[PDB]
């Protein structure tokens, strides 16, 4: 079939700047190729048409160009709201009317290092049965963290749960939990609790812990 | 003026069948020009199927292997999705649309405000706040955690609103079976001078824990 390509997934610019998106069909789709906006919560909306014609009401530092097999969207200079995912679709006769990866334009700002906290499950929740064990990172830039779980100095895989904010609009950095999972019975057959952090603004790893049982 | 509403939410055990309904008000356009698409959480979007101007009835996205069908009532200006032998990968968010140059200044663009729907094996359960203590061990951070819940609007305040500054509430996760978890920030003087509560108002189950937060002591 027709395949859309959107490289790179991710572009990090500064408020202002010039932002080229890139998309890249597995064979020519002549000029029959849309772009489209997609805002947090809300549906998409159709942006460029026909490789390079702006779509009615839409402003004008946003423009298509290219034809058969490779296509850009700029936006000149982007503003606030701009700051979105793109995608295109290929919109020819040959279905399925396949739409490219997307891709998501990001505030760059400067390196900031995560504050890290962690959290023994409560007494509340073990009389329950289960042992939920969180560790936060909060207000970090960029998005790239890894949290590694420790359980008596044994890695902890395929055993806990990551989520993360959207880029925050005051500062610009994102925030992660971390969430370690252990049944009661499991966690009481164990001592010291650490999640590791290692981030882009650190020079070393975090290590957040505590031993079951103390204050 | 011209608008395209959707269905309501919708939860379906998976197997069974769901069929979203799409009614536009205004405009004059023929039905069968509504096109569907979805899109799974935190993933793009992928289109379902539609009629290519130059055929007569619509096409489906291959993947789907059959499971797909669209219909278009005249009469009620109704375009209807019917998606059969649910897997839990169809569990997205689905948008009915009109793009493209049908025949009136530019492409159109008319979009539904889209309709959850949500397969899988379980089944509904209102959920319990557990108290993510400030450590006594400068800034503290404190929280709520909202574990084993179905139903999915779980909203979260902090002291009824009056508190917003440094909040962060995570997306929720899903387990292997079966979660989210809401922070704030805060001074560390404040710690037993004011008194900090979540508010989870979770709308479908009628539950209305407000749980409070303190400070973890010894003995």
């Known amino acids: 079939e027709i395949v859309l390509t959107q490289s790179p997934a991710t572009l990090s610019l500064s408020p202002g700047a010039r932002a080229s998106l890139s998309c890249r069909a597995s064979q020519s789709v002549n000029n029959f190729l849309a772009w489209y906006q997609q805002k947090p919560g809300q549906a998409p909306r159709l942006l460029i048409y026909?490789?390079?014609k702006r779509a009615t009401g839409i402003p004008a530092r946003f423009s298509g160009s290219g034809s058969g097999t490779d296509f850009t969207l700029t936006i000149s200079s982007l503003e606030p709201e701009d700051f979105a995912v793109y995608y295109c679709q290929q919109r020819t006769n040959w279905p399925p009317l396949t739409f490219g990866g997307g891709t998501k334009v990001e505030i760059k700002r400067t390196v900031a290092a995560p504050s890290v906290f962690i959290f023994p499950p409560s007494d509340e929740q073990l009389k329950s049965g289960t042992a939920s064990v969180v560790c936060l990172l909060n207000n970090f830039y960029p998005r790239e963290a890894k949290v590694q779980w420790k359980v008596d100095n044994a890695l902890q895989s395929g055993n806990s749960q990551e989520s993360v904010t959207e880029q925050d609009s005051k500062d610009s950095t994102y925030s992660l939990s971390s969430t370690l999972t252990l049944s009661k019975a499991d966690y009481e057959k164990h001592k010291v609790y650490a999640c590791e952090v290692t981030h882009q603004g650190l020079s070393s790893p975090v290590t957040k812990s505590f031993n079951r049982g103390e204050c | 003026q011209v608008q395209l509403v959707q269905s309501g939410a919708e939860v379906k055990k998976p197997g069974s069948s769901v069929k979203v309904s799409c009614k536009a008000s205004?405009?004059?356009?023929?039905?069968?020009?509504l096109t569907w698409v979805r899109q799974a959480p935190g993933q793009g979007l992928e289109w379902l199927g539609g009629?290519?101007?130059?055929?007569?009835?619509?096409n489906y996205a291959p993947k789907l292997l059959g499971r797909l069908t669209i219909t278009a009532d005249e009469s009620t200006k109704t375009s209807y999705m019917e998606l059969s032998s649910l897997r839990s990968e169809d569990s997205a968010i689905y948008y009915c649309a009109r793009v493209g140059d049908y025949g009136d200044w530019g492409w159109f663009d008319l979009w539904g405000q889209g309709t959850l729907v949500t397969v899988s094996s379980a089944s509904t359960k209102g959920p319990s706040v557990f108290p993510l203590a400030p450590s006594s061990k400068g800034t503290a951070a404190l929280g709520c955690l909202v574990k084993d819940y179905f139903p999915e609007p779980v909203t979260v305040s902090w002291n009824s609103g009056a508190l917003t500054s440094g909040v962060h509430t995570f997306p929720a996760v899903l387990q292997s079976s079966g979660s989210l978890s809401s922070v704030v920030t805060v001074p560390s003087s404040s710690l037993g001078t004011q008194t900090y509560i979540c508010n989870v108002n979770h709308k479908p189950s009628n539950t209305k824990v407000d749980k409070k937060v303190e400070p973890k002591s010894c003995d």
């Open positions: 009629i290519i101007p130059i055929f007569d009835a619509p």
């Open positions: 205004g405009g004059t356009f023929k039905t069968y020009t």
């Open positions: 026909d490789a390079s």
